[PDB]
Each structure stands twice: as structure tokens, then as C-alpha cells.
Design an enzyme around this catalytic site. Structure first.
Site, PDB file in Angstrom:
ATOM      1  N   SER A  89      34.202  -8.456   1.388  1.00 50.77           N
ATOM      2  CA  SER A  89      33.525  -9.469   2.190  1.00 50.77           C
ATOM      3  C   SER A  89      32.141  -8.988   2.558  1.00 50.77           C
ATOM      4  O   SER A  89      31.163  -9.704   2.348  1.00 50.77           O
ATOM      5  CB  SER A  89      34.311  -9.761   3.463  1.00 50.77           C
ATOM      6  OG  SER A  89      33.580 -10.682   4.259  1.00 50.77           O
ATOM      7  N   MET A  90      32.059  -7.764   3.080  1.00 54.59           N
ATOM      8  CA  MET A  90      30.784  -7.197   3.440  1.00 54.59           C
ATOM      9  C   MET A  90      29.964  -6.939   2.187  1.00 54.59           C
ATOM     10  O   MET A  90      28.787  -7.167   2.203  1.00 54.59           O
ATOM     11  CB  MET A  90      30.951  -5.908   4.252  1.00 54.59           C
ATOM     12  CG  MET A  90      31.732  -4.860   3.453  1.00 54.59           C
ATOM     13  SD  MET A  90      31.893  -3.340   4.430  1.00 54.59           S
ATOM     14  CE  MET A  90      33.178  -3.905   5.575  1.00 54.59           C
ATOM     15  N   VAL A 114      36.186  -9.511   7.726  1.00 54.09           N
ATOM     16  CA  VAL A 114      35.321  -8.929   6.694  1.00 54.09           C
ATOM     17  C   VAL A 114      35.918  -7.638   6.116  1.00 54.09           C
ATOM     18  O   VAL A 114      35.828  -6.568   6.715  1.00 54.09           O
ATOM     19  CB  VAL A 114      33.886  -8.710   7.267  1.00 54.09           C
ATOM     20  CG1 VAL A 114      32.995  -7.913   6.304  1.00 54.09           C
ATOM     21  CG2 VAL A 114      33.235 -10.084   7.480  1.00 54.09           C
ATOM     22  N   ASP A 115      36.446  -7.741   4.895  1.00 50.63           N
ATOM     23  CA  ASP A 115      36.963  -6.571   4.198  1.00 50.63           C
ATOM     24  C   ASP A 115      35.784  -5.915   3.489  1.00 50.63           C
ATOM     25  O   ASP A 115      34.646  -6.380   3.648  1.00 50.63           O
ATOM     26  CB  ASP A 115      38.069  -6.956   3.200  1.00 50.63           C
ATOM     27  CG  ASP A 115      37.511  -7.801   2.056  1.00 50.63           C
ATOM     28  OD1 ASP A 115      36.703  -8.671   2.327  1.00 50.63           O
ATOM     29  OD2 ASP A 115      37.902  -7.562   0.926  1.00 50.63           O
ATOM     30  N   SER A 116      36.023  -4.856   2.716  1.00 49.40           N
ATOM     31  CA  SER A 116      34.912  -4.209   2.026  1.00 49.40           C
ATOM     32  C   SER A 116      34.248  -5.196   1.073  1.00 49.40           C
ATOM     33  O   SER A 116      33.027  -5.224   0.970  1.00 49.40           O
ATOM     34  CB  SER A 116      35.355  -2.983   1.249  1.00 49.40           C
ATOM     35  OG  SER A 116      35.855  -2.005   2.151  1.00 49.40           O
TER      36      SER A 116
END
Length: 81
Positions: free
Chosen positions: A42-43, A38-40
Site C-alpha cells: 500500500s505504501m 497501509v501494508d508495505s
């Protein structure tokens, strides 16, 4: 009515929908960022899906707190019912 476990089933979908992380892969011990990749974004996308799908609006404070399934999912179930 989704319990925290269900938040992972429901999140499993969103997660598999945004990051494509497996329903199986979304356990209560997987780091969103490190284990669920979860990258920025993704979140951010997950937060959007969460805000709409679960009615859970994760503020910047929550999103940064939400780094593992325990925080993410617990938060989702926090407002879920």
C-alpha cells in the site's frame, strides 16, 4: 498548490485509489498502516503515486518513517507546493 490539508485531499484520492481508504478516513491522526490499512505494498504503491502525483520520492527511510498520516502527509507537503 496543495497545502498539507490538501495533501490529504490529494492523498485521499491516491489512498482511495490504492487501499481504497476514504477521503474522510484519511485524517491527520490515522495510522497509514493500522488506520488506513497501509501494508508495505500500500505504501509502496502510495509512494509511487506520491512520487508522480506530488513529485515526492519517499526513500526506504521515509517510507518506513511514514507510518501515520502526520508523517506521510507532512512529507508529501514537504516537497509539495
Amino acid at each position: 498548490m496543495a497545502d498539507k490539508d490538501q495533501i490529504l485531499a490529494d492523498m485521499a484520492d491516491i489512498v482511495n485509489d490504492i487501499t481504497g481508504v476514504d477521503q474522510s478516513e484519511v485524517t491527520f491522526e490515522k495510522s497509514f498502516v493500522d488506520d488506513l490499512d497501509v501494508d508495505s505494498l500500500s505504501m509502496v504503491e502510495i509512494i509511487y503515486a506520491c512520487d508522480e502525483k506530488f513529485g515526492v520520492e519517499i526513500p526506504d527511510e521515509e517510507s518506513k518513517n511514514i507510518k501515520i498520516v502526520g508523517d506521510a502527509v507532512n512529507y508529501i507537503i514537504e516537497h509539495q507546493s
